[PDB]
Design a protein around this ligand. Sequence first.
Ligand SMILES: CCCCCCCCCCCC
Ligand SMILES: CCCCCCCCCCCC
Ligand SMILES: CCCCCCCCCCCC
Ligand SMILES: CCCCCCCCCCCC
Ligand SMILES: CCCCCCCC
Lengths: 131, 126, 128, 129, 131, 133, 138, 127
Amino acid sequence: LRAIPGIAWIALLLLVIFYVFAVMGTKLFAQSFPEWFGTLGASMYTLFQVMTLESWSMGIARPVIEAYPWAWIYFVSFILVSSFTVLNLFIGIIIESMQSAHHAEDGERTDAYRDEVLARLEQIDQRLNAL
Amino acid sequence: RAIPGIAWIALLLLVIFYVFAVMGTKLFAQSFPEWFGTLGASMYTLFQVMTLESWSMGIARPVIEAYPWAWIYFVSFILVSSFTVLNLFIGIIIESMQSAHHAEDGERTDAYRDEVLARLEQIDQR
Amino acid sequence: LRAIPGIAWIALLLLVIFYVFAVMGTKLFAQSFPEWFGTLGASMYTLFQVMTLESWSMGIARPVIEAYPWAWIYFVSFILVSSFTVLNLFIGIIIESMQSAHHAEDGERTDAYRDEVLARLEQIDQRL
Amino acid sequence: LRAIPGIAWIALLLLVIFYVFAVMGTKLFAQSFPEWFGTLGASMYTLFQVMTLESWSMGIARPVIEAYPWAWIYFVSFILVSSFTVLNLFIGIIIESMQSAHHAEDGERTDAYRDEVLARLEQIDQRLN
Amino acid sequence: LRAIPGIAWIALLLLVIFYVFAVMGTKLFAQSFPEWFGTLGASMYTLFQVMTLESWSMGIARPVIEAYPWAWIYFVSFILVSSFTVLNLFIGIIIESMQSAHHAEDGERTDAYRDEVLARLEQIDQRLNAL
Amino acid sequence: SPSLLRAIPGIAWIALLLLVIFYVFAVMGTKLFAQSFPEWFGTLGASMYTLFQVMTLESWSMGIARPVIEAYPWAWIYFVSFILVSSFTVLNLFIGIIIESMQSAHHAEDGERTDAYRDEVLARLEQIDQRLN
Amino acid sequence: SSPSLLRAIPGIAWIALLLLVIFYVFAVMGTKLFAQSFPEWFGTLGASMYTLFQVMTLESWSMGIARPVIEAYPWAWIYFVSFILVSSFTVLNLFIGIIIESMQSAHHAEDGERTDAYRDEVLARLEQIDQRLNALGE
Amino acid sequence: LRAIPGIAWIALLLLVIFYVFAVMGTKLFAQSFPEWFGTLGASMYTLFQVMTLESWSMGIARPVIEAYPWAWIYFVSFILVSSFTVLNLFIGIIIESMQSAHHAEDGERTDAYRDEVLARLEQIDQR
Ligand SMILES: CCCCCCCCCCCC
Ligand SMILES: CCCCCCCCCCCC
Ligand SMILES: CCCCCCCCCCCC
Ligand SMILES: CCCCCCCCCCCC
Ligand SMILES: CCCCCCCC
């Protein structure tokens, strides 16, 4: 019933997410956006800032004011990462909790049926009066 | 259901929205007085076109006035209706009958517990 | 023992990820390669070909040999698509079949438990 | 049960970490780090050689660390490859074993319940009186 | 004639060069490179790998460019081992085989000399009968 | 160096430098493990003693190289030196002696056959002689 | 039997390798007593071979660099002599050994030609075997 | 035929041996005593002097042997120098002489055999 260890797996998939999409976003954010005018060792770091840290949400929303017609899916990058994570993580948690519940209750009913085992072998073998 | 997720499928559904909303509302926006400068009214327009009030097929036609360049909307309305119907209805059917199998057969086995105790009482009580 | 709408939305996700890497091929390298300079609407053509077709379009993924350390991700991208989708789909559906197998045989054993019911009855009144 | 898909998709993303840090260690550690002289396609071999073999390619590692301000991220590569190794190996093996254990053990104790069936059939047809 | 044991002789001597120069290398370069830095357990294995494998070994040899004039003699030492040893074994082969060739073939010629013996011993006695 | 003559004392020179090898390596390794070992309670002068011990004779002396297994971390290669020194002795000396023997065999035996041909020259004069007619 | 007829040359590698060693050896023996006295090189940590082959009669000026060994009479004379003795070993071995070995080949071929004079004696054997067989009369 | 300079080759290599053992002595046989008190490059001097000459460098030989286990090796150097020189010098001269011996001896006997040639043709051609 040990189904917890699927936890760190999501965080290392998060490593995958941040690598891929911070690299793409850091190319398109190093190209023209003047907030940093380039991010190689601080791409992870800038996206992680924008993730409701250092009060920097609208902070990133300004360099996309300097390119609005073709740069919005970067704040939507925040959105995408959040959604993908929350989805898989949350649903795994749900399934694990509910397996535990169902097995617990149904097993208790069946061990009452083992009490019925007790009843039976007390009935026949233990009260024969001739052996 | 594979390793996919329900609201994750729905997320890719509004990603489809991004796709074909952006395409359409970017291609012919500068030439039509229906949704003149269609920017955020794309999702609304289409997801409201789907079989709503039996009239939005009617609004799908005035863009059929641009058949060589505006039939992908026929394609796309078919897309959205298709995946909505399929996913929602049929997936919920299978979910419901899975839960049904479990609960139904469990309560039947509780009636079996009834059988057990009835017989054994008839033998033990005397 | 019922998971086929699974296959349905899996095909949907297939088309979605096809579009994803298509447009990624239309933006990251679009100006540098005149191979299909305007991939905006025919990265489909390019990548459909790249689909191990006639052993030459892994070839036509070559304009990634243009920038081999960084863009090798299109070849690796068909790798990823095939792996995740085909792998998970195929195996998981077969596993739903093995679920059905469990149900059938172990239910027959519980009808041997119906034989238990018989045992009950033939203990009750055989020996008043 | 015996699931292949997990380990398969793992192996893919594990190898994507491999090429990422191959690039990480082949562009900044080739033209001036001649331990691996012409490191463009050899980076695969260099990194996986650094992986815990005879305790001597970690010795190849340190003179690369001689460039300390810009030469740290590939034993960072070490820790990321360890990330994926931990995941696949540990989780797969342990959880799978105990799943199968649940199955078999519960079945066999129900067979003990069948010996109780034998008790009832003790006192129908063996003892009439 | 059959001196492949002598090949083993020369081979053992050149491997003596191998061992003793590995020991002298343990002496001069033990702490200087961090390449192995423990040149106490596997000095053999060290120079073993240094010997022309994947070209990564000359790359093993520069971490003791850490000591420029105090480790160059080992670059030329592996020159010594490789070239000297291979050339010695081919020396053995060439020279001693061709010595055997001399003896065999010129002995065949001297067996022709046996035949000339035969002809004149034919001319022993023929002048007693028809003369 | 084709000479077809007796070239054994070169191997003899190698053999006495092999005695020097005994001396050097055995006295190297015999002095730092003279304190911490119970066998001779000081190998200060037991190195050629270990010569006639561990030159692969009696089959128990690599058995006493085992007490060097007792000191594996920085003192392992020394019974490998045992193995070496044994190979030194056997191969070098034995090859020298073998080629010695074959040298002698060839040269002497074929010279004697030539002497036989000279008896034939005296025959050719058997007809340069009495049967002159 | 073909293509060499006593090519026992390649062992000349030995010579060259001795060369290297020799260089090293007595470079060190000049780096030991010197390398702290003279100001010229003033660190012979790796200048050993550089300076030694410079003093190998280069531009008629590195005997010019041998002047600072004239700066010390007894304790500094035998370095140019180092060079002479290196030349002794290497040149003697390679050239003169190869030449004398070829002249040993001359030994062999010369005595073989004498055996062809014994082919002359073959001439005489057939002077009698086939010629005066008394095939006339009597 | 006259491969003579090899002996000088061995002799110069012997000089190299002298240097090597000189520096080993310099390690042990420099300061273990006050008997030479510094030998950082003069073991050559003391060894050429001790080579059983003048009968007094053995008077040198004791105050180094004051440390009995750590000094007899220089006398063993006597032995090393001996072995090297004796073997190679002596037998090299011997071997060269032996080569010349075989050739001279039996080739000259075969010149006599040429006179044999003349005798046998004196019979077979004229009678
Ligand atoms: C943010 C990038 C997605 C937009 C890609 C172009 C969409 C318009 C396609 C027009 C095809 C004629
Ligand atoms: C739009 C129709 C697509 C049909 C794809 C069929 C795939 C069959 C896979 C066979 C695996 C058993
Ligand atoms: C990467 C480590 C390679 C170790 C090689 C050991 C020696 C193998 C000898 C094979 C001879 C053909
Ligand atoms: C081709 C696949 C053969 C089976 C692979 C098993 C992988 C086990 C990983 C254990 C890592 C220590
Ligand atoms: C949010 C957890 C961060 C853990 C540190 C990661 C260092 C690469």
